[PDB]
Amino acid sequence: TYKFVNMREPSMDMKSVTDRAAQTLLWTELVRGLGMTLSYLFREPATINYPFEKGPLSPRFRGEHALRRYPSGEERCIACKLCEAVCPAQAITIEAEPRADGSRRTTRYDIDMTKCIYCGFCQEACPVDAIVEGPNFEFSTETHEELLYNKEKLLNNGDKWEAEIAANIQADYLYR
Amino acid sequence: KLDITTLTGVPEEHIKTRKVRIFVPARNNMQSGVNNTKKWKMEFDTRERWENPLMGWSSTADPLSNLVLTFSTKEDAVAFAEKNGWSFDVEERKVPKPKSKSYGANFSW
């Protein structure tokens, strides 16, 4: 098992001696490495042309949050409120009150990307699969107050992307 | 009276103008369970907690509202707070009285 890195030692044979001496005086390995970077000059550059091209991702990838509707057009969220109860950063805050119809609903679902750690526990937790960690990954913004999403904001994110998200979940759920 | 107030960095305000409130917690009555009931704990008194002007969050000032500590014996708890030089409100363990039960007493007549 155990292996000796090094430990191997140079021969004192005169051909070898002259070789190492000529190596020192004439810099063989030096020019070797130099030739190596020469060799990497000729390979095709790895850069992608962002924005105009964008890097590969995955169906499972996590990003901006977004509550989302039934196809019926009704919202999914039902305030079982355990999204609050499982987020380690406890970013989420929820305050449900009854619908006039009598159905359970949120009044001010909110979240703040300032504290959220994008761990995707909320994505797992929801029994009705309401909140979803959306594919979008870019929403850097000027002002701190914008980070602190309101419920309406999440819905708008759910409106913007719904075909996309439904596509990911469609492509992914079997592995769940 | 092993006072250690100088050793703790705690500001004088909160070894002074507030009190601990030792008790063995009551059973949640919705529950029929008994487990969480036992073992002394050392809750502090509540102070002010207003509201965030933005987003409506319950912003809060007091340094140590959420603190709470389990114990095995009450004397140990009182002595504990005494070591801290703490004001306290010890409360009795209030075990339910044992009660007679009989399925057949339902069928007296």
Binding site: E95, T107, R108, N150, K151 | E51, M55, G56
Partner: peptide, 18 residues
Amino acid sequence: YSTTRKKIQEWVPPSTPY
């Protein structure tokens, strides 16, 4: 912005005298 309306809705004195 703030969401979920109000809290205490405290009452106020009547316009009418006495």
